Amino acid sequence: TVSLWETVQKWREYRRQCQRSLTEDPPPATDLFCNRTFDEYACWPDGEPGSFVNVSCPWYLPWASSVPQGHVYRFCTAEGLWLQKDNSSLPWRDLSECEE
């Protein structure tokens, strides 16, 4: 099976690549975009207002080859703010395609 330490190593490389992307990717066409971020699980780019933002299932997942075409989703509202889950401070997120 896939070990914890191999998954941790892959996660650190994913985080490191994401932080390079966050710092170096050119800015969006307007601050009306939702802002790029790393939520500890996936790397989110800038989001167009009023549309869904999809990112490939994180490639460090132990079962990554079980979901090679899956996507995790956020929604960027018309206000340029990530859609939030009520009863929490966290943005709404659909990861169902990246489950085991």
Partner: peptide, 26 residues
């Protein structure tokens, strides 16, 4: 899932999965 090595392999696989679940809720 009948032999000792099935349990030990399951235990090792769970360590990685709990780490994912920590990232998710985190």
């Amino acid at each position: 899932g009948c032999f000792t090595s099935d349990v030990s392999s399951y235990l090792e696989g769970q360590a990685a999965k709990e780490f994912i679940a920590w990232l998710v809720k985190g």
